[PDB]
Nucleic acid binder design. Structure first.
Ligand SMILES: [Mg+2]
Ligand SMILES: [Mg+2]
Ligand SMILES: [Mg+2]
Ligand SMILES: [Mg+2]
Ligand SMILES: [Mg+2]
Ligand SMILES: [Mg+2]
Ligand SMILES: [Mg+2]
Ligand SMILES: [Mg+2]
Ligand SMILES: [Mg+2]
Ligand SMILES: [Mg+2]
Ligand SMILES: [Mg+2]
Ligand SMILES: [Mg+2]
Ligand SMILES: [Mg+2]
Ligand SMILES: [Mg+2]
Ligand SMILES: [Mg+2]
Ligand SMILES: [Mg+2]
Ligand SMILES: [Mg+2]
Ligand SMILES: [Mg+2]
Ligand SMILES: [Mg+2]
Ligand SMILES: [Mg+2]
Ligand SMILES: [Mg+2]
Ligand SMILES: [Mg+2]
Ligand SMILES: [Mg+2]
Ligand SMILES: [Mg+2]
Ligand SMILES: [Mg+2]
Ligand SMILES: [Mg+2]
Ligand SMILES: [Mg+2]
Ligand SMILES: [Mg+2]
Ligand SMILES: [Mg+2]
Ligand SMILES: [Mg+2]
Ligand SMILES: [Mg+2]
Ligand SMILES: [Mg+2]
Ligand SMILES: [Mg+2]
Ligand SMILES: [Mg+2]
Ligand SMILES: [Mg+2]
Ligand SMILES: [Mg+2]
Ligand SMILES: [Mg+2]
Ligand SMILES: [Mg+2]
Ligand SMILES: [Mg+2]
Ligand SMILES: [Mg+2]
Ligand SMILES: [Mg+2]
Ligand SMILES: [Mg+2]
Ligand SMILES: [Mg+2]
Ligand SMILES: [Mg+2]
Ligand SMILES: [Mg+2]
Ligand SMILES: [Mg+2]
Ligand SMILES: [Mg+2]
Ligand SMILES: [Mg+2]
Ligand SMILES: [Zn+2]
Lengths: 252, 91, 77, 135, 112
RNA sequence: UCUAAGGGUCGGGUACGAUCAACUUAGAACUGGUACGGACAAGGGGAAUCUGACUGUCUAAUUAAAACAUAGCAUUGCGAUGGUCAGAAAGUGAUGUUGACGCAAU
RNA sequence: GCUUGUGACGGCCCGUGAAAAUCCACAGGAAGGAAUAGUUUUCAUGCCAGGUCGUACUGAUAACCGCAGCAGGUCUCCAAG
RNA sequence: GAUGGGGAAGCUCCGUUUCAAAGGCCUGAUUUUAUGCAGGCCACCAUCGAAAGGGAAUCCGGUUAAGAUUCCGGAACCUGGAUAUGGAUUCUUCACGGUAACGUAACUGAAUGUGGAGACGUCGGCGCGAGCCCUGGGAGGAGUUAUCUUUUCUUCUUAAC
């Protein structure tokens, strides 16, 4: 048989990200002396649109504590931050929207974005437009800080991990209907060649597990096991349940 | 003279895409093209471009906001719940 | 490629070391709405620029012709 | 208190001497045929003395501490009145309305203001009027 | 009714291949390629086309005298003279308030 | 072959005058073998049933369609020591200049 | 009026619409610099030099690809009444 | 797509700043003398890849059987290397003038840093430029003229800098 579509993507020829116009990589500052003993001041020189990205970016320039020079970082714009604002970054730093603080140093209920998984990875969690994490407690011995991630998951990370106070700008973007193919076209045009999607049930069997038949149908259960092998996994991979989710969601 | 009975700005799509989709768009589209009051300079010159980004005509300030409206209700309460928590660390 | 009117500066150009050749041009034109007059153009060829002095006064022209340095090649007309 | 008077130091906020410190010597608080606006005759500092160190020696110090002054009519709205102040007696009779108009009179005037300033810098009276504003 | 042709191999209408039509002393029409238009320099502080400064293409600023590339006040060919007015007042006021900040918290240390 | 309406430009003590230049539109007479968008140019319309919402896409060289796509709807996987995917292997690689308002799979 | 150029604006975006070479400016003040005479080549003028390869013509119902001087195919500028 | 490297029996595969001791400029030191060392920087880390992207600088007239923005003529411009005379500047050494926007023939400026230009979608109407189109008077040439037409056609141009 043929090699099915989801298998071709890993080679990354026509499926690599459409990257030319991107502003750069959004990252917290390097976790240097200033940030983990005191705090450092910067000015958001500009907040700007990143192509293919939901949320606007915030260009925030600092002084270099070791050489006479300006060094600029690329933050994700937390909603409310503006051109000309002073951003503070450090262990001892005020709990104001836009500043970046180690998770250990904010009370419970704090709402932060771009938070680090391990301390120093310059921003892992809560980056897409409209997302955030909430701190739900602390364990001062071992200095963990229990947080809740946008999925609902409740991970526990180091209290040294850094997050930026507030939520990420550009929320509600997904409440507007795309309304027509072209909008989705220009959407994925600046992300990657994932659109449009021929259904595996409209191809011949060479092409897909779902292919063929004199009527258009899946033919066997579309729930595929985790242990399935490449070229088998298409449909509902490892589905622990299926069907229209009725009743209240919201993890207990 | 009143030109259209309900479609308003949404009349450009005409009959296509279904009344309800058009209705939802018309809301956010009206939300997103509008002129807003500027916090800094007290004029109503904030307008959007590039969802998330809101800059003021004069006074040249640019604020990060919601995708089709300046302030989003979420970030609004987050402002206050941070205001509340902050005050717990001085008094 | 340059125009000149300072008759003093002009003679200073005509004796500038690099200047070896010049030329006088005689044109017949009219005077302000009516009769004709005789315009002369003194063109001094410098090593990188051609200076030309327009002397509309016919009398100022003749006096300025003999004023020319004797060691200067001066193509007539 | 009416403060733009004959002693107050100010910063020139527009023009070529923008950012440099001055002293009012004689205020024309309201109008002039020539200058129909609130203006002040001020002597200022154009090229400040360069910072001097112990490593600086015999004739380097004498060179480093030379001062280039200037004299200017200046609208009030282009001055920033400072809290400090500096005495004006050594060149009261020099920085005048008559002083401008005749370049020669401005040239001599600057000489008086120059020596009166360089003496003031040594034995560092006012110590701040002689410290370049950085911006 | 007289038509014209490019004067360089490049046959397409690219921005580096702009054309002007011109009437010559021969009494005929002939194209003449036009360099791309220059843009004005900009205040790094505010962003306006900072006045006083001549507007050329960047390599041409090396064939022009310094007076065309500056104005006499501080931050001449760099900032727009209202930003200079501002970075003056801001500088002076901050240095003043900075003095206020010290002796206030010096008296704090003497009475607390 | 006529009528009417629609403009510009210059002095006025601290109502108008004078002059120059444009096809538009409407109305009225006269006139012809009743003809006149005179060639050229230039929509047939209506009432229904089936079917795909629509614009869009494909069997180059017998199939353009009701087929594919699409927006919308719904389900599934995954918090990076990860999901899906590539490779003989690797201090290898795609998604990823990414982080659940995300990526991947139906 | 027509073609093109350009300006100040306005509409649109879950699309907000390259990069590097190169050139200039400013901040800075290291340093060097005159009275019996210095500093000045971003002002003017003057001196020398600028290599290597392409450059014909066709560009199509006959100069290209379609076994060919094939009714096919093959990127584009100028454009009168 | 090389390179310290890491795979692979191996042809070779992977990585491109990548777990690498990765390199070169300004001038001072010399008066054996030519370039050793005395400073201080830069840690930027190959290279290939556009005859439509970016980009130093030229025009008009004339000329050939066949070449021309390339020859001829005349008039420029850029870049690099030399440089000297004139102007400017200084005894208040490193220009003055304007309230200001800013003005100018000039009007010293190393390291370092910073700003700008290169450098950017699309459509719409509105404003202006150019070349074209239309047209009046005149000064010429041509056509028609049984009759009509102060008519029909045509010349009246001005490059870079
Ligand atoms: Mg297979
Ligand atoms: Mg990539
Ligand atoms: Mg595709
Ligand atoms: Mg589909
Ligand atoms: Mg699908
Ligand atoms: Mg099929
Ligand atoms: Mg199969
Ligand atoms: Mg199966
Ligand atoms: Mg099947
Ligand atoms: Mg089915
Ligand atoms: Mg200076
Ligand atoms: Mg050619
Ligand atoms: Mg200037
Ligand atoms: Mg100028
Ligand atoms: Mg009329
Ligand atoms: Mg009239
Ligand atoms: Mg029919
Ligand atoms: Mg259809
Ligand atoms: Mg077919
Ligand atoms: Mg077949
Ligand atoms: Mg069809
Ligand atoms: Mg067919
Ligand atoms: Mg439905
Ligand atoms: Mg290994
Ligand atoms: Mg065109
Ligand atoms: Mg834009
Ligand atoms: Mg510049
Ligand atoms: Mg020069
Ligand atoms: Mg060579
Ligand atoms: Mg040829
Ligand atoms: Mg032929
Ligand atoms: Mg053929
Ligand atoms: Mg004609
Ligand atoms: Mg390789
Ligand atoms: Mg190359
Ligand atoms: Mg090229
Ligand atoms: Mg090019
Ligand atoms: Mg020729
Ligand atoms: Mg020949
Ligand atoms: Mg030829
Ligand atoms: Mg020649
Ligand atoms: Mg010549
Ligand atoms: Mg030169
Ligand atoms: Mg001067
Ligand atoms: Mg630069
Ligand atoms: Mg730029
Ligand atoms: Mg470009
Ligand atoms: Mg030219
Ligand atoms: Zn404002």
């Amino acid at each position: 048989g043929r090699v099915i579509r989801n298998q071709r993507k890993g080679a990354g020829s026509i499926f690599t990200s459409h990257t030319r116009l991107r502003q750069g990589a959004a990252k917290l500052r390097t976790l240097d002396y200033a940030e983990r003993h005191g705090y450092i001041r910067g000015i958001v020189k500009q907040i700007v649109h990143d192509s293919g990205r939901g949320a606007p970016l915030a260009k925030v320039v600092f002084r270099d504590p070791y050489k006479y020079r300006l060094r600029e970082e690329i933050f994700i714009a937390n909603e409310g931050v503006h051109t000309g604002q002073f951003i503070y970054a450090g262990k001892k730093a005020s709990l104001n929207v836009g500043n970046v603080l180690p998770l250990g140093s904010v009370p419970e209920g704090t709402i932060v974005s771009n938070v680090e998984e391990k301390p120093g990875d310059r921003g892992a969690l809560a980056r897409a437009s409209g997302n955030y994490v909430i701190i739900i407690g602390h364990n001062p011995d071992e200095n963990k800080t229990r947080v809740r991630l946008p999925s609902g998951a409740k991970k526990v990370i180091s209290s040294d991990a850094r997050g930026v106070i507030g939520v990420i700008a550009g929320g509600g973007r997904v409440d507007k209907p795309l309304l027509k193919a072209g909008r989705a076209f220009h959407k994925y045009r600046l992300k990657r060649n994932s659109w449009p999607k021929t259904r595996g049930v409209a191809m011949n069997p060479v092409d897909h597990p779902h292919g063929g038949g004199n009527h258009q149908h899946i033919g066997k259960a579309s729930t595929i096991s985790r242990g399935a092998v490449s070229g088998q996994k298409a449909g509902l991979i490892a589905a622990r349940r299926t069907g229209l989710l009725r009743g209240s969601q919201k993890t207990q | 003279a009143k030109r259209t009975k309900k479609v308003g700005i949404t009349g450009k799509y005409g009959v296509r895409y279904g009344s309800s989709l058009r209705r939802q768009v018309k809301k956010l589209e009206i939300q997103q093209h509008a002129r807003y009051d500027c916090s800094f300079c007290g004029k109503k010159t904030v307008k959007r471009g590039a969802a998330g980004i809101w800059t003021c005509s004069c006074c040249k300030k640019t604020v990060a906001g919601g995708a089709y409206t300046v302030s989003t209700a979420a970030a609004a309460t987050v402002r206050s719940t941070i205001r509340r928590l902050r005050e717990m660390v001085e008094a | 490629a340059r125009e000149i009117t300072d008759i003093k500066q002009f003679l200073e150009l005509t004796r500038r070391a690099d200047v070896k050749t010049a030329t006088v041009k005689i044109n017949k034109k009219l005077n302000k709405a009516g009769k004709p007059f005789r315009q002369t153009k003194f063109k001094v060829r410098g090593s990188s620029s051609l200076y030309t002095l327009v002397i509309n006064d016919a009398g100022k022209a003749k006096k300025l012709i003999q004023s020319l340095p004797p060691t200067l090649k001066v193509n007539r007309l | 208190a009416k403060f733009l008077k004959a002693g107050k130091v100010a910063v020139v906020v527009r023009g070529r001497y923008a950012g440099k410190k001055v002293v009012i010597v004689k205020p024309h608080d309201e109008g002039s045929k020539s200058h129909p606006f609130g203006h002040a005759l001020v002597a200022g500092i154009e090229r400040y003395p360069l910072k001097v160190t112990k490593k600086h020696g015999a004739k380097k110090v004498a060179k480093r501490t030379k001062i280039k002054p200037f004299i200017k009519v200046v609208n009030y709205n282009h001055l920033l009145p400072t809290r400090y102040t500096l005495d004006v007696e050594a060149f009261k009779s020099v920085v005048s309305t008559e002083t401008f108009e005749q370049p020669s009179q401005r040239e001599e005037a600057k000489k008086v203001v120059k020596k009166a300033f360089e003496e003031r810098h040594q034995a560092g009276k006012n110590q701040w009027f002689f410290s370049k504003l950085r911006f | 009714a007289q038509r014209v042709t490019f004067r360089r191999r490049n046959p397409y209408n690219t921005r580096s291949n702009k054309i002007k039509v011109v009437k010559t002393p021969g009494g005929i029409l002939r194209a003449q390629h036009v360099k791309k238009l220059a843009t004005r320099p900009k205040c790094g502080d505010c962003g306006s086309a900072l006045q006083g400064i001549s507007t050329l293409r960047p390599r041409q600023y090396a064939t022009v005298s310094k007076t065309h590339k500056t104005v006499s006040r501080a931050y001449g060919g760099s900032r727009c003279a209202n930003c200079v007015k501002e970075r003056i007042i801001r500088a002076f006021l901050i240095e003043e308030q900075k003095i206020v900040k010290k002796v206030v918290k010096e008296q704090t240390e003497a009475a607390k």
